[PDB]
Ligand binder design. Sequence first.
Ligand SMILES: CN1CN([C@@H]2O[C@H](COP(=O)(O)OP(=O)(O)OP(=O)(O)O)[C@@H](O)[C@H]2O)c2nc(N)[nH]c(=O)c21
Length: 162
Amino acid sequence: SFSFGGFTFKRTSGSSVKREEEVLTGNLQTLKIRVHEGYEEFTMVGRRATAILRKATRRLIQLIVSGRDEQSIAEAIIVAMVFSQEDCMIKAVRGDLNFVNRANQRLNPMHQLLRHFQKDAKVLFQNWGVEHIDNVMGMIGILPDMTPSTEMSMRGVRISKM
Ligand SMILES: CN1CN([C@@H]2O[C@H](COP(=O)(O)OP(=O)(O)OP(=O)(O)O)[C@@H](O)[C@H]2O)c2nc(N)[nH]c(=O)c21
């Protein structure tokens, strides 16, 4: 297990090979990220939300989240989207990233991204994408403005009523 974004991640299936990649944000800032290539499934546990995530190579496949309120659910979605390393997330960055930790040391690139989207996830959610969903009992969709929907949801994302 490891911790990211206030969530305890535990991998429950799959594996990944690693490779270094440089990505370029819209503000023309180069970020050096470590990509984990391959299908993996994780449970995420937070203070007020939990999630199950399936990802592949820079690609969120499926995310289910449960939480007490809109805020904590949003927090889990943000962490999963950043963790996915999806291009649309990199492209959602606005301005330069220069965040530091509690010892004023520069955060590594995944935490630069996390901090950025913890401040504002509007562009992230807006650029992520939406899809039609099926009616499945116990599950509901969520739109980029956090409105629930029985018909549509952000791509790959479902909210559990349980
Ligand atoms: C995006 N990220 C970041 N990340 C981090 O990289 C750590 C795992 O690195 P690792 O131990 O070198 O790879 P691992 O798959 O565990 O190797 P192995 O299973 O052979 O022991 C995780 O604890 C986590 O902090 C990731 N780890 C996994 N498994 N998948 C991922 O997508 C990611």
